[PDB]
Structure 1
Amino acid sequence: LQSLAILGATGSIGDSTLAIIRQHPNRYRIHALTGFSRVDKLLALAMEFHPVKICTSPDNYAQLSQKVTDAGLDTIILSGDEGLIEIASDEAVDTVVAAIVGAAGLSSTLAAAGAGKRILLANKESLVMAGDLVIKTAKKHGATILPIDSEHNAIYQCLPAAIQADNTAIHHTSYGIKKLWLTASGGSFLDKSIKQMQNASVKEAVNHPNWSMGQKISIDSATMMNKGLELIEACHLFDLKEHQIQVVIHPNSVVHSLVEYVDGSFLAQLGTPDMKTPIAHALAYPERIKSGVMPLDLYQLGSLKFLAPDLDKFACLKLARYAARLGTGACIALNTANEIAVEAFLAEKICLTDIAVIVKACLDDKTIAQDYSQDFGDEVLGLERILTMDKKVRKIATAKIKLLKQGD
């Protein structure tokens, strides 16, 4: 039985993954499950699946160990990055589902790559932060990356077999891949003024017309930073530069992305917007399996809309492409500044529209710019340099926010 370790098991992507597993018992073994703050949920999950290991936050280590023994479970409890890395590199784990949010997922994804694991990547921030190093390390050590991100899974499904195996084949012109097309819902402020976007409450920003997701990706969807990060993710996943990857607004969230070929064929994946489809595809690959989604009814669709991105209004997407052109240092600055600004938005400290301001200022910061030319792709010193650069951006983005609330 394919052995599974699920990182970020307590969150949104955690839920859909687990929902597939419950439809397919005796196909997968659950070896490990991780959470951070939701101890009780993690416990509940441990009692249900009886995993060999689980990992929680350092502040919940003791408490969770006590509850686990009180429940009479044989399960090992771990904590912090330490435990994630152990689980990600664990010898008895066949497949790792990387669904931790944000930079926090970086070390363990990198560890699964280092251990030659089959990796199901939801955690898009870890490739924005360290794409060169992640991919290099995977190839070096024989790890496989299947994308879980909906768009990237669509693109992956719509690419030839040879290129799924080896992303570099995309540059052989026989295959005739011309460009990739990323679809974006345009989030909940697509048909709203800039005025209403400033005034947005958190409830308005966090809720999405078509998708039910984690908090952060919800805010990113509203600002369109999500597509920005997806732009960089696609770059590393399919070994392209930003010029080969374009973006179309599509509010229905039915078409999930396209690959354009030289003969004029656009191969696309369509589906009801539900992460169980991409997750199910990646779990069973090369096979397929029922996912438990309510399949798309083509008779009841109506009009699928398409539209050019309004880049004044969704400057995050502008900035993301700008950063993609500058390389990894600027992609770290993009991502981390974004994490800090989103935290500030959710904490009712800035306006939704200030997220773009903060992120520009950090991209255009001289102190940050100085780091834009290091070897973040170095297999021995690269990690240390990404984590250091991350700390610096957190410091400056925070300062930037303080400054903005008065004047610069």
Structure 2
Amino acid sequence: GRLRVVVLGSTGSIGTQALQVIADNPDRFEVVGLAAGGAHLDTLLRQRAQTGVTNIAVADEHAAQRVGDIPYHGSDAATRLVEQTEADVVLNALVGALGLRPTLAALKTGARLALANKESLVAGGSLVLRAARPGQIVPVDSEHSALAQCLRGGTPDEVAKLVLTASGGPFRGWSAADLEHVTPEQAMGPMNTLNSASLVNKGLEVIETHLLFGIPYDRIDVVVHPQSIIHSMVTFIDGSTIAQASPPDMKLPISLALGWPRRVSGAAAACDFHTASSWEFEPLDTDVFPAVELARQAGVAGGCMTAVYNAANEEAAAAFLAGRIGFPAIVGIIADVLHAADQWAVEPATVDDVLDAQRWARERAQRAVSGM
């Protein structure tokens, strides 16, 4: 009785690592579907050959044509694959807010959603939550996987605080003036790396924490931990903190999300306490790095505001990577877009509501770029 797994974004870092965990664990997992964008066809063809899975979605029509025998092709390909494939688990490792429809489709099938695409939850907000049963979304994000594990340390009424760790990025300790000169070269993928550096990733993760676990924003702490060995912690009402620790390796949270609640033997190397190490903690410099506070503000506003936060980032980040704006302008644009986003506090009733909010935010972010 193997779990049938659909892997969305199969050719990316998380996707390939997931396929490796599945290949190492044939008694527990079986691949039944693959989805890819179409930029890494070499990898996709190998994946088809090795897994024997022809049930494949390709987003780019030209790429799907170039390949051949692809049953699902076009922008809605991944969504239709999910809708029409019998599965126990959908791993959503697509990139960006475009993971939204496949996330909704997955939840509506009743399968466990192993979520790597944090953007679909951040953007979807209550719309995504209303489609899910309790515990149906299982995080692949390292911090949230850690939180889920640490929450086993007590009952829900015993939780005082959730403590999200953050690497601090390559610019930890830098001044506001220092960040002016940051180049795209200095800052997994281009977006994952950049969002880490700008602290917008951590803002997205704070929102993700609130939505997954239902804890109020004022009880979600962020601490900088440069070693990235402690992946997050939960503080309980008696003063006890339970923390999860492991050498960085996404195969650990991937494996746990795929097989929840059961741990997968040998998924990753454990901390080695026969060698010296230091786990350091320091407060986030919120003045220099206000992305987390902006996320909290968007989160408290709720409705479609978190979709706005993410959409504004996607556009500003693209502008930065293209050499059009400076590094500090990323969070500057997000703030400008949010201040103008009055009407988006309304709760999304349909996917179209979220899409409307994102459309508006993308336009407004472009407006903000044009004024620079």
Write the distance in 1 (CA, Å) between the matches of 2:353 and 2:309. Answer: 16
How far apart are residue 291 of structure 1 and its match?
Answer: 4.2
1:276 aligns with 2:251: yes
Of 216-225 and 194-203, the range deviating more from structure 2: 194-203
How far apart are residue 138 of structure 1 and its match?
Answer: 1.0
Alignment of 1:332-351 (within 5 A): 332-351=307-326
> What does residue 315 of structure 1 align with?
290
Secondary structure class of the residue paired with 1:305:
strand
> What does residue 198 of structure 1 align with?
180
Write the distance in 1 (CA, Å) between the matches of 2:65 and 2:83. Answer: 25
Write the distance in 1 (CA, Å) between the matches of 2:180 and 2:273. Answer: 37
Alignment of 1:37-56 (within 5 A): 37-56=39-58
Secondary structure class of the residue paired with 1:371:
helix
1:249 aligns with 2:224: yes
Write the distance in 1 (CA, Å) between the matches of 2:154 and 2:281. Answer: 31
1:147 aligns with 2:139: yes
Contact 2:168–2:225 (Cα < 8 Å) also in 1:
yes
Change beyond 3 A, Cα 1:300–1:352: farther
Change beyond 3 A, Cα 1:105–1:301: farther
Write the distance in 2 (CA, Å) between the matches of 1:351 and 1:39. Answer: 34
Write the distance in 1 (CA, Å) between the matches of 2:131 and 2:76. Answer: 19
Secondary structure class of the residue paired with 1:336:
helix
How far apart are residue 150 of structure 1 and its match?
Answer: 0.6
> What does residue 166 of structure 2 align with?
184
Change beyond 3 A, Cα 1:346–1:201: same
Contact 1:61–1:78 (Cα < 8 Å) also in 2:
no
Change beyond 3 A, Cα 1:228–1:24: same
Q: Tell me the TM-score normalized by structure 2.
A: 0.94
Alignment of 1:2-401 (within 5 A): 2-36=3-37, 37-66=39-68, 69=69, 76-139=70-133, 144-160=136-152, 170=156, 173=157, 176-205=158-187, 213-365=188-340, 368-372=341-345, 374-376=346-348, 378=349, 382-401=350-369
Q: Spell out, residue by residue over 1:342-368, the C-alpha distance to the aligned partner (whole angstroms, 9 max, x if none).
A: 111111222111101110110112xx3
Q: Spell out, residue by residue over 1:261-311, the C-alpha distance to the aligned partner (whole angstroms, 9 max, x if none).
A: 111110110001111111111222222223443322124343211111100
Q: Give the partner amino acid of 1:57.
A: A
Q: Tell me the TM-score normalized by structure 1.
A: 0.86
Q: Spell out, residue by residue over 1:77-123, the C-alpha distance to the aligned partner (whole angstroms, 9 max, x if none).
A: 31234321222223421110011111000001011111111110111
How far apart are residue 226 of structure 1 and its match?
Answer: 0.9
Change beyond 3 A, Cα 1:156–1:362: same
Change beyond 3 A, Cα 1:80–1:63: closer
Write the distance in 2 (CA, Å) between the matches of 1:143 and 1:312. Answer: 36
Secondary structure class of the residue paired with 1:274:
coil
Write the distance in 2 (CA, Å) between the matches of 1:236 and 1:292. Answer: 27
Detail structure 1 runs of 4+ shifted over 6 Å in the superposition. none
Write the distance in 2 (CA, Å) between the matches of 1:104 and 1:57. Answer: 11
Contact 2:167–2:224 (Cα < 8 Å) also in 1:
yes
Of 356-365 and 324-333, the range deviating more from structure 2: 324-333
Note the residue ranges of structure 1 that are not aligned, 5 or more in a row: 70-75, 164-169, 206-212
Secondary structure class of the residue paired with 1:314:
coil
CA RMSD of superposed structures (Å):
1.9
Secondary structure class of the residue paired with 1:179:
strand
Q: Give the partner amino acid of 1:153.
A: S
Write the distance in 1 (CA, Å) between the matches of 2:66 and 2:266. Answer: 32
Change beyond 3 A, Cα 1:309–1:6: same
Secondary structure class of the residue paired with 1:248:
strand
Aligned residues: 370
Note the residue ranges of structure 2 that are not aligned, 5 or more in a row: none
Change beyond 3 A, Cα 1:161–1:91: farther
Contact 2:228–2:248 (Cα < 8 Å) also in 1:
yes
Write the distance in 2 (CA, Å) between the matches of 1:254 and 1:181. Answer: 14
Contact 1:280–1:291 (Cα < 8 Å) also in 2:
no
Write the distance in 2 (CA, Å) between the matches of 1:96 and 1:78. Answer: 16
Secondary structure class of the residue paired with 1:247:
strand
How far apart are residue 40 of structure 1 and its match?
Answer: 2.6
Q: What percent of counterpart residues are identical?
A: 36
Contact 1:116–1:143 (Cα < 8 Å) also in 2:
no
Change beyond 3 A, Cα 1:291–1:282: farther
Write the distance in 1 (CA, Å) between the matches of 2:153 and 2:239. Answer: 20
